[PDB]
Curated annotation (Swiss-Prot):
Outcome reported for the amino acid change (mutating T26H): Facilitates transglycosylation more effectively than hydrolysis; covalently bound substrate
Induction: Expressed late in the viral replication.
Effect upon mutating N132 to M/F: 2-fold decrease in enzymatic activity
Taxonomic lineage of the native organism: Viruses, Duplodnaviria, Heunggongvirae, Uroviricota, Caudoviricetes
Effect seen on changing E11N: Loss of 84% of enzymatic activity
Compartment(s): Host cytoplasm
Effect listed in the UniProt record for changing N132I: 5-fold decrease in enzymatic activity
A single BP term in Gene Ontology: cell wall macromolecule catabolic process
Main subcellular location of this protein, as a coarse class: host cell
Name this protein carries in UniProt: Endolysin
Keywords: Antimicrobial, Bacteriolytic enzyme, Cytolysis, Glycosidase, Host cell lysis by virus, Host cytoplasm, Hydrolase, Viral release from host cell
Cited SUPFAM superfamilies: Lysozyme-like
Amino acid sequence: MNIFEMLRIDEGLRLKIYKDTEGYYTIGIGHLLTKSPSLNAAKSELDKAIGRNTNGVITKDEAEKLFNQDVDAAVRGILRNAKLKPVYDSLDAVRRAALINMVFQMGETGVAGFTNSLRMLQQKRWDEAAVNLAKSRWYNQTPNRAKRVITTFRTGTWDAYK
């Protein structure tokens, strides 16, 4: 297991524009296109992202390309963020993947706001961090995915993904 396989499990793969769990136009492996209710706007973003006129459909290779860019972006977002970087640096590689997963789903600014959870993770108070992480809109709206990510933080194992 690794961050790519983990997020593939959590995000799936769809080659046509779909709406994500928040109702936002998305494609591939959880690649958010726009929060606009306009499908045409989403199609424009998609064509820009891929570099051709797609008409809302991409190939698996193209989906995996966006995915690699998006994982890369999540990591660089963490490293450039003054709140997230020290937490990330303090973690083992498995728990680092859990943090990347959160940033992929909610964005750097969103995760950086989990101030008390981040402190508990930095303190390596794993059970406490897990309890705090679940007191969130995140957990309530996507509980099965949040449970997997939280288990990964609690245990430092890949148990929730096998």
